[model samples]
Target: RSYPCDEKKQNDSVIAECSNRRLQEVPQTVGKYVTELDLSDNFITHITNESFQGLQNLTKINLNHNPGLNITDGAFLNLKNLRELLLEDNQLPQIPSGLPESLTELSLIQNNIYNITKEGISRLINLKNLYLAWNCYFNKVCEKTNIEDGVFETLTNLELLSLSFNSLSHVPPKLPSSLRKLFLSNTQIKYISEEDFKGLINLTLLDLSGNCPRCFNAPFPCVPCDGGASINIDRFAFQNLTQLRYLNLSSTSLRKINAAWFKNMPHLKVLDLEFNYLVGEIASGAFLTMLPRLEILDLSFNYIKGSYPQHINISRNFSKLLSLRALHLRGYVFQELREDDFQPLMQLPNLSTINLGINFIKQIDFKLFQNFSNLEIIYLSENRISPLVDPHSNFYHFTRPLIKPQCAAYGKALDLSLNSIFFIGPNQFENLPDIACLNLSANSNAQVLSGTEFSAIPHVKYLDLTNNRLDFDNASALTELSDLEVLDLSYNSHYFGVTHHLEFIQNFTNLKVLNLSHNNIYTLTDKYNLESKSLVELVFSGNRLDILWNDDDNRYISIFKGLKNLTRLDLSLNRLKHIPNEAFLNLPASLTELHINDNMLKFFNWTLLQQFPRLELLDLRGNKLLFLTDSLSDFTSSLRTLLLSHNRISHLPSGFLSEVSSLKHLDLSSNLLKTINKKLSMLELHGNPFECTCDIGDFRRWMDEHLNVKIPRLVDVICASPGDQRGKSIVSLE
Candidate 1:
């Protein structure tokens, strides 16, 4: 009478979970005290009246993901205390009968449920939430739901209902007044009147997205609001829901947003109308109502039509939203900008963030953002920003910053990445005194980092210059910023070698983090050794630093010889096969974490652990190690995490875990090891060919003795030998 599932004790009740076992029918002999049962992802096709005849105390049951499932009458009547039932993706032709009156939540989404009559669900007086979405839409057997007027009104305590993705021709009639949230998205309904939501005063969140979606660049096979017209709405359609706080009408084909439709929702805090055709409407003074509590507005991914004008002027239309803090206008195709394009939005006292990225912006006045004083984040990436400067002046003089000093603050960030720029020289970004972060990555065409490029914006601390051709003056352009805390120079040109970047590293005396990964640097000549005592974290991944040690001539030196304060070092993806004893000899004693994964190394010198007296994390994954040394009784006393996964190691040395007194985690997954018992905080032994037989029956007893220690993915740790126990959990060996 064993069950093929995991059993757990919660509070004073038993819970059985048997999901994804290919179960064809419900288990009949589960413990009677089990209050939660998960039979999802199974092959069961029907439920009989005796399915749970004795489990009267069951409170939650999940029968989801069982396609073509059917329920006979009285199938669940015996479970008088069931509170939640899920039948999602079952494709049932109609509603099931005998649903207990004590149920509080029910979900039949993605099914073929055809109708909701008073007799079907009206008896469940305690039902508080019901999800019937995807029941008719795209369902093969049913296409519509005929909701009787009395079907939902009887649930006096119902607070949430989701009828989205169903082919309802209009709003459901006589919805319960107690509902606090209603989701009716992606339906065929195209009209709304004042009487539709007349009594839903307590509703706080309503979503009507995708009802009349814009279909030109649709992400799905959408239905257009017919005849190129938007959904017809009575001006006072939403007059009754005064308590509503959140409303989403995204992807609708609405041509205009009338103020009268929102004048009654006094407390609406978030109004999302993104992915619609509201550009023309918004520009024409559509938002005439003052929604004082509205804080966020999203108008992303809605572009103008082919015949429409390319430029859109956002004047004072949103001035009435006095409390708005964020606005999104991404994915537009406008290439030009007027000087005063975003002027009116400066009136918003609390506007702090705006997303203006993913647009076709080619040229714009650089002074357009001078008055954005309170904004903290300005996202304007993935555009072509070619400063149309006067050809007569030095191109550097025309270089102006969108974030002028007037609008600059200590924490404000501007994202100008992924643009087409010409060059970065001194005064390239105007003298901004207080800005903290600037991202100019992916401007790969910029061929030069001209002389002292960043002398203007001297106070910036975090800078990203990845994926650029910062090769002209070799980082002399970055020598002025000695106070930088984090610097990213990954994926740049080969000019960032030992000769140029070495001198640049010495200039940053206060730097703490640096990333010089994938710069095609293959050599670290002995002529110039790294002298960065201030660097704490450094990355040299995706490079060919192995060439330095592989050279026959004694022409190379350890680049990290002078980093006495470096705590974390990443050398992944270096195509390393072996390293000399000097590789980690000069690394600082303060080192704690080291990542040398994704290499071709065959053997790791265990005695090198003495190099870093304080190292705790050593990542050696994705290597070719077939064996390891047992010289662990050294400087590994402080090591807590050791990763040897994704290798060819067959087994560990004799004293693998005895010396690791402080090891908290040891990952030996995806290797060729068998039964090797060890004691640690967390052990991941999956992806190994474990053998469960009398040869190592101690593993089972030891596991039982140490039930407090975690052995995760235990389900995959199946027995690989002994025909009687093969394909079964190794821990279950008896």
Candidate 2:
């Protein structure tokens, strides 16, 4: 057997997937059935000593997406059963010393390597998992120079270590009491003195994501609700991770999080503070003390720009997320979530999901969920909502129309979609009947849904009504829902599609997703007969369809083939641009998310969606798509989130959105973007066209000293070119 490559690179011979191909060496040809040896995205940048002259039962080796790997310094001498060594996306400039006494796992991610000799990683004595991520080290270094001396005595069996995106200014003098998990994110670490992690006595888990530390100096941090506000007093960044469970000081420059800042992790659970710079006064016992084993708390993109007047009044520091279950307060700093901000989020009680998406949370006081009785999902979508307000005077609760606890704890879904709503009244959601997804889209001022506004939901099952102004008598509340299944009346330019036997589109036959995109639908005539029959995904994107037939008054899928459970069909932003290859032929097959993003003209006859085979998510972002060659032919690789942000791209085409790895939220805002190329979990380059020059002068000195993801005060997000204050208001360029 000339090549046993880990017993045919086992997929589960115990799992192994050799990374990036181009291997030039380091393959000692699977010396004695290697355990795992993936020279990640290879081209072997180098690593002498025969790289591993025959894996001695190599435990694992995945040289991640080789940005030209590097190893020298007796490259793992002679793998003594190397436990795991995945030198992540490399380009190492330094930090490579002997380590092989059965090295546990060392993934040096995105290496631009910058010094790391904690005596060469404590000498990896059975190290656990040390992945030095994104290292462009030595950056402004400050946190008091951590990990220098003795360095964890030799990583006493280090458990899980990922020095997140390095430059670690300091805070690492010791940490190896058999470390459990410690990842120092976005380094150049800020201050954290009280003990600077007095040698992690079994540190449970601590990920300082986007560090800005200095917990007690930088104009802040005197705690007690920032007394006179202006803190920077790091209480030793949670002493020794005291049995910490999980902690990510997101975007760090934290302005406030209180309760004496959790006195230093007391059995923390999971806390990723979304991008920070948290403005002031949070206290109310912040986390009721060191996150009392927090569960999941991601304070989304902060700037804490708003909310004060005593955080709208929900005392006890708004009821301290008693074991939060998942809370990411996205953007625009909670511009008012009153009702005492749900009194400490309904005292946790194992909360489920409450992403106040795109903050500025208009009205929602249902008594702040009167202590959630096991809440589920409530992402109050985009903001500026509706349902009437003006609850006489104001002391918060801003005039009325609040729900949560008023809806009495039953939440399946309530994403009020973009707001400025118009009508739902009739006791709005009359105490939701275990609601089940109700989106209410853009809402260019809703028009009707009457029928006592849905007569208490009736077990609704996904109802969107897209951009509103709907009519068709709001489809008579779909004849008191019978568990409807997804119905987004698309951009309702006043829905005019399914007519004839309308009366709720023929009783929705347990529909399965039907978005009537944009609107002003021209014809599907036969009075847009939906003859239901259990339809399945039929988004008529944009609209005014004109199928083939030189304009047979805009043909109709032969009358929509009578939708016999029609499988996915979105005639994309309409006005026909050629498509006769059997326009939909006969559909059905459990279609999938598809929308031919904005339309115009351009080639795309490419076997028109290979006639569906379960198409995942496909949307040709605003069209006229210059070139995508074969638009990912028949998509695969799980084709995760992709929306060619506005198109007209300026560059980047090398692996495009790096093959959407289950891509999480990405919306290259406005387009013509300047930078911020994928590799995302959350990204949206607001209105694009950037150039605040000096090469963005460190992103304008990090939004003038990041207090957490700034850039809001929008008025057409300014400054594209020069002229001092180009179009002003990037928060007035600070």
Candidate 3:
């Protein structure tokens, strides 16, 4: 809030609510009639040379998020009425010289900022939105610059542009036909120069995530990348985006996605690659060229792993996303999802969601979701299903045959959670019709059943057998799911010691969410001795609990005595370490998600989990913990995802996670990490051992000088002793 609006404004600004505000610096108090200067989330680090001396009625300057902002070389000399410069999330290693010839929009999205010189756009002559999303300078590779030839010819009115990630390996044919949206995602950017988008035809969206490229054929094998060499994409690289309509080449490393990579983008429309690494076969009209207005298509996490081999001959192309609605056939080594695995998605007639989540789709006959009549959501989670030997075997009648009925775009939703299901035959959902929602939760051998194996799915409203290995005939094969509301038998083992046949909750009187978490069955101790009237969500995280009193409570009363419509409850992992300072005295105030992560617990007793005033999602990761104590800061507005990775953390405890503050994805990797404690915003330590230290001098100069983080090959983080001798090969130390 530092005034600077004097009117006569050009493209000044109104700054959207600056996100992630913890701001450290960079607020040189702009008010020379501030034009447009967002100063993107503060924490001003460095930016030499008259850092905007006197904003001559600046133009646009949202220095994006400022991750320890650093920018040297004549930082922006003297705004000279800076044009448009959004320095997206910054750390800045390069690209920050004089720039600002009354720029257009120079958004440098997610940045650690690495080289990209054509003399750094020869001083932005009216540039355009150049948001370099999540960067490492395009994944490293800079032998003294490349990206030449009128490098964007002084932004000739450049439109939405993004040198996508970066470390680009080729794909430079002087683009500037007033470009229109292009973000070359996660870059190793496997080639593209067939006169790469030669003078773009006004491209519209082009992200190539994780890029690996190169798998052409005819002995093109020469792989050995460190600096350069190994590309391809040339087959007329999309013949000029052709007004391309969204195209993200997911996890690059592609292995032939032929059809000449979309025969020149015939009006392509939304085509993200779940995971590249595609292998042989499946081509043959790879979507039959000139994609006739393709629509939402993602070859889910690639390598199309397995299945679909043995007696090849597959050709049911489905006119390539001919208006495909949504189809993500993921891969975790997809083990058979046959029946021509949705023969080109059963000729998409407006396909309605069919994400074969994490493949391995075991058997499924009974006309399994056949010929989509506008199929509605059907993700066969994980997969390796069993049961149903010969329901007209053709590998179970072509991977789950029946389920294509209902009208009005058939209302169906069935995600057969992690599979290997032992059985569910018995007429198995006899002619499914409008399945509300059915996820046979983690099937640890679907209740070792002998009978009632899912009495022919009687239209299950919602059912999940969380973990699995359930018993009592798998809760009597779910009392034939009489429109069961929601029921997840969380982490089963039939509540440690099987045999629980409590009249199947009196036929689930229309039950509503009841996850008996990490079972060993106990507690919920008689929700009216299990009459379970419309119960509404109740999970008891990892078992063997202590409290939840009942024996004539010694003052610590209220243990959900009748749970009339028990809102929700989940106690997460269990083994609560020390919860007894009047332990939130029986506080299940309509629980939400209290998963006390892998426990042993060392600290965190927010006066004993802040009397659970309806906790949201407070999972404390594998615990044994070491700090994070201040009595777990009064459940900061129902935590959102606090799984503090494996414990024994090396440091960080001061304000023990300043009460959530809207924490989002803070997985501290495998713990025992040497540094990087807070300054969070989605940071994960792959499998931490992160000590690649030169006395913490390495790991990218401690993620570029003290945890501004971005450590990929900090010179390959060596120093294994007197060993890893600093830089025999890996450089970039400063």
Candidate 4:
């Protein structure tokens, strides 16, 4: 019953893994050179002073996920060199004393700890991070953490502290002044006073609201003392955190932001104020001095009016942020965005990303983004922005119908998915010359994209047109994207016996990855072959592609021969019955990964796979395979990962896996497999019924002797034969 131990190269330290061993006590004898120990996922309930009394060279210990674990005082008194202790997901009531003073990091999350005092952790003055989340809530209620005023005064090296879900009504007094990140979210904190964080000058990231005090519901009880009032923020609450870079005050139900609140934070970069109750107008200069160096600002999921009549000069306040790069304003109360709505954003040269999804913007002017030449990515999905094709509309009456000025938006990516776009013209994307990726999926109303509709955006390298109503015959419209590398045509209108062939993709000579899955493509015609020599991966799963071997001279083999660089192919869920012997005679040798699972194949000839000399992974799961015959002895030796689960395979010739020494990962789960070869390194034999009599004595001994391999669910392999040993684990046998 020896534990798994890996001797060190220099004999100075050893790495031992006693995890998942159902261990109730620390082993009395371990390797003398062990420096790291993993005791997770076990039944260890108690730790006394002599738990690890011999050969003390340990430096790290992981006791996580021990539900009944309880440590006595001085349990770790002798391990003076320990540096890390992971005690998450345990039953500890409070932090145990007598910890090693040399510890640098400690994790005690998801425990039963409700009270924490300074003296409990004062001895470990070198602690840098302390995690105590989800430890104060039990039995549908919370026990507020009680702290002494100077509890953390001696820990000057602490940098990151997490007290989230601790049920504290206010910030604990006198935290370590060296803190760089602090989290007090999911608590009863209702107000922010300036004196709460008076001395923390090095704080960089602060999160006070996991959804603010006023928004807590159900499992998290709201603070009943606030009388349903919004959380109040003192004007100078963050006056000293000049080094603060990230602040999350979201869902606090704040009505306004005064500039005086952020006068001291000069290095602030990301501020999240989403999910608040802000509805009134904001002062024009409210953020002028507060966020001068901000880069990313999120004001989404609020009722802040975009263009209020009372705040006519609000746009001036936003225009002052010249260094801003990304802004999120989704779910705002804005129905229309006129030229004046974002006039100030044109002056900011570095602004690149903008998210305006889930809005009511009906139409956009052609010259809307004419001034922002550096714009890279824009999201307009889930909006009411429809195409302007009505000839007699007010928009067409002012300007020429099809001769409008080119848009100024030029960048790498654009997402117009899930909008009301009924038609996309060739000139629609004429302005985005440098665009590399475009997602136009989920616009079901769009139909019959003209053959030359995408002549613009010639540099687009990837395009996603999934879940649209476009006809596959018009796929030539994408030929203009000469550099297109990836194209997703899944869930389109292509069906069985479709007339249009997939030969039009030959125009994209540089294409590498193509996804035509879920389109019910039933025919792979012999007339045309995929001419993309550089194509590497192709996915045809979830389709009716049983047309691999038809009469008239092996067209399937010829089709793949042209894709010389094809290495990965997914043809799963296609209801295939078998692979023809001739299918592998002239197969491409570059295929290293093939996924043909979830089919109806009952017989597979292994010798045919010798043509794939470089094959590494083969997935044949969810099929009707019964036996791995001796003919498989000639299979590829380079195969490393083989997934053969969800089948009826039961028998294999002796020394079957010994032929392939490179086998690393094998999954034969949910099968009738009883005994396996002992040469495997990583294996999954779960759901297999094994006979636990003398017939299995050799395999049971191998399970205990082999310590370097990983056999998943090794202990759960139950006995099925011989009523005496029924329902008993194979490992429990003598």
Q: After superposition, how far is residue 599 of candidate 2 from its true place, in Å?
A: 17
What TM-score would candidate 1 get against the native?
0.87
Superior by lDDT: candidate 1 or candidate 3: 1
lDDT of each residue in 331-355, candidate 1, tens digit only: 7668876657777777789998777
lDDT of 2 at 6: 20
List the pairs of residues colliding in candidate 4. Answer: 14-33
| All candidates: TM-score | 0.87, 0.32, 0.33, 0.85
- Kindly give the stretch of ten consecutive residues in candidate 4 with the minimal lDDT sum: 395-404
Q: Is candidate 2 or candidate 3 better by TM-score?
A: 3
How far does residue 471 in candidate 3 sit from its true spot (Å)? 11
Tens-digit lDDT track of model 3 for 1-734: 22111122345353322334344554454455656656555566776666667766666667666655667765775667676677766656666766757776676656555556777775676777766554554233443224567677667777876665456565556667887876665456566766777758888777765556423231322232343233357677776567788877655555556567676668877776554545442445364445678777666554433344322223466455578777665653544544564566676678777676655655555365756677778877776767554111211002343232321122477877777665565565655545766777666654455435555556666666667675643345466666776666766774233434444665566777676766764444233244455776666676654543222343223434345566555556666675444433454456565556766777765554555556656667887777555435554566555667788777755455455555555566667655433333444554444444355453343343433322221222233223354223223222
Candidate 2 residue-wise lDDT, 669-705, digit = tens:
5666553322344445556666565554554454444
What TM-score does model 2 achieve against the real structure?
0.32
Clashes of 3: 31
By lDDT, is 1 or 4 better?
Answer: 1
Best by lDDT: 1
Model 3 regions more than 4 Å off: 1-46, 50-63, 66-73, 76-86, 89-96, 99-107, 110-120, 123-149, 153-414, 417-425, 429-438, 441-451, 454-539, 542-548, 553-734
Ranking by lDDT: 1, 4, 2, 3
lDDT of 4 by residue, 1-734 (tens): 33333233336666677688667778765776678888888888888878888746888899988846778887887887888899988878778887888899988888877777765898789999988877775356545677777878788999998887677778887888899999876666877888988879999999865435335332434443355466667888888888999887766666667677688887888887766655443334466545778888776666543442211223467876878998777666555666676887777878887777666566655456556867776777776656545111211002231111121122367777787766674456654435677777787645565456676567777888888766755547577777778888887763225533676666677888888878776565445455668789888788764665453565655556667888998889887887667665545689999999999888887777788889899999999998775645476777888899899888756767656777888888888877664456787777777777677587767666766667765545677767578777676677
